[PDB]
Amino acid sequence: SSGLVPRGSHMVGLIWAQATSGVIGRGGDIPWRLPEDQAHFREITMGHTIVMGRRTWDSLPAKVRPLPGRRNVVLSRQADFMASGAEVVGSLEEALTSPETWVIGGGQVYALALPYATRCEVTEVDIGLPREAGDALAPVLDETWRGETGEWRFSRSGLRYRLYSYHRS
Ligand SMILES: NC(=O)c1ccc[n+]([C@@H]2O[C@H](COP(=O)([O-])OP(=O)(O)OC[C@H]3O[C@@H](n4cnc5c(N)ncnc54)[C@H](OP(=O)(O)O)[C@@H]3O)[C@@H](O)[C@H]2O)c1
Ligand SMILES: CCc1nc(N)nc(N)c1OCCCOc1ccccc1C[C@@H](C(=O)O)C(F)F
């Protein structure tokens, strides 16, 4: 792999935060808050196109969306769903037109985008959140993904967390 992104290519990355159980979402929200993760998510995605599921757009408070500094693209199959300030498309093929795209959730769209992704950036939060029915979950990465696992760090909010970076060809 290479860190340089040619402008004629179409690099797709996924970025998410999970509990150690793999839970990423419950009841339309993220069931923790971690300021180091919010800063990390902004550092990675700023200046790029972000692609999200309709349900992830819904989870953003109206006053904050579309997320600033980034082209917001929302995936929906509903012909009458609209996202003020952002573009709604009906497929991943229509959304992945930029040279660098970060898929920012949620559970459904991660699984949808994984076959095209070459990078994942993960935050793992050491919170004991067991999986319940209806939870959004992080995608599982098969053996074609090579990962770098950071050591455990400690949040100002009192949770342990660590970062992973995965790549593949
Ligand atoms: N921890 C994190 O990193 C993180 C990040 C983001 C979100 N989240 C959480 O994850 C949850 C949401 O995830 P989710 O899996 O329920 O939903 P989602 O992936 O965010 O969005 C699902 C919606 O995307 C649309 N969609 C899915 N597949 C499609 C396809 N093939 N073509 C076109 N549109 C398609 C559909 O919208 P329509 O129904 O309108 O057709 C579907 O209902 C929330 O709890 C949110 O807080 C967590
Ligand atoms: C941040 C959670 C997250 N973390 C990783 N690692 N990946 C993701 N895809 C991810 O979800 C992004 C979509 C949900 O957004 C939010 C959820 C709760 C609070 C604030 C934001 C706004 C956001 C912004 O305004 O940029 C950020 F700064 F915090």
From Swiss-Prot:
It catalyses: (6S)-5,6,7,8-tetrahydrofolate + NADP(+) = 7,8-dihydrofolate + NADPH + H(+). Its EC number is 1.5.1.3. NADP(+) binds at residues 16-17, 24-29, 53-56, 75-78, 90, 104-109. PROSITE patterns: DHFR_1, DHFR_2. The keyword Chloroplast does not apply. The keyword Oxidoreductase applies. Substrate binds at residues 15-17, 37, 42, 70, 110, 123. Residues 11-168 form the DHFR domain. It holds the Pfam family DHFR_1. GO terms for cellular component: cytosol. GO terms for biological process: dihydrofolate metabolic process; folic acid metabolic process; one-carbon metabolic process; tetrahydrofolate biosynthetic process. Key enzyme in folate metabolism. Catalyzes an essential reaction for de novo glycine and purine synthesis, and for DNA precursor synthesis. This is Dihydrofolate reductase.
